[PDB]
């Protein structure tokens, strides 16, 4: 089962809610404005503005994604053993996931893997910001090698 599979369970998926977060920030009038505000021309979060991005984003995740994820995993266990992918372990922890939990890393630069991948919905930079948000969302635990 793909990580994003939980996303389209809601008719408005999690991604457009994340896109609409921008309306809750003063001085930002569009998602594009949010992107140019949070990044410093070198695709680096300002390490403070990303703070309020997390401030706004975390309630969305913990109040919307977590329960639907809980039901999704509960039903998924019924069909039998499955391989489940996620983006941050806290997703599975807050969803009361059942089964062996593995945190795995990769010997690559994951961030560069995004903006080259064309045909993105909200723009590649949005995907970069999303990846940063998930990485900040993850817990403190040493991920083993994927091998």
């Amino acid at each position: 089962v793909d990580s994003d599979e939980v996303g389209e369970q809601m008719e408005p998926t999690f991604e457009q809610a994340v896109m609409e977060i921008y309306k809750g920030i003063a001085g930002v009038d569009s998602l594009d404005d949010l992107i140019k505000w949070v990044l410093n021309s070198d695709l680096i979060p300002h390490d403070d503005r990303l703070g309020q991005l997390f401030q706004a984003f975390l309630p969305l995740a913990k109040d919307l994604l977590a329960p639907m994820a809980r039901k999704f995993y509960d039903n998924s266990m019924s069909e039998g053993r499955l391989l489940t992918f996620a983006h941050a372990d806290s997703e599975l922890l807050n969803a009361n996931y059942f089964g062996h939990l593995l945190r795995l890393k990769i010997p690559y630069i994951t961030e560069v893997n995004l903006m080259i991948r064309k045909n993105r919905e909200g723009g590649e930079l949005f995907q970069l910001v999303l990846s940063y948000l998930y990485k900040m969302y993850a817990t403190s635990a040493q991920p083993k090698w994927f091998g």
């Binding site: 410093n40 021309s41 070198d42 403070d48 703070g51």
Partner: protein, 140 residues
Amino acid sequence: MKRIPRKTKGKSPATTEPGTSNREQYKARPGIASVQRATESAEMPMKNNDEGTPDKKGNTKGDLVNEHSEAKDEADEATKKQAKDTDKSKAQVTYSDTGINNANELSRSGNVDNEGGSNQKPMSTRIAEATSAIVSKHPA
């Protein structure tokens, strides 16, 4: 003829010479974009301060507050703006609640006209009342 609009409302043979090839491998340090955005903010002129000055009608504009109070509030606004700029809950650099006892500091306000009198009533209103106390009408 060339016409320019207004920004303000008014009264109304081979040719490939061997040096032109592009081999850009130089990354400026510091970066061009960073210093450009930095100097973009310093470019901006300082804001206007119209308050306390008359308008075309003759009535001074601004707020009706004690000048001491406006000085303190205006310092607090600056501290808040500084905090917002630094992207912190506190401003590390404060213009208010310093050690200096600047109690006598004054700032321009709309409370006092150019004559040293109070703006409790607009100047045009004073002129109207003064001039209407002498008018005479047709005989009975």
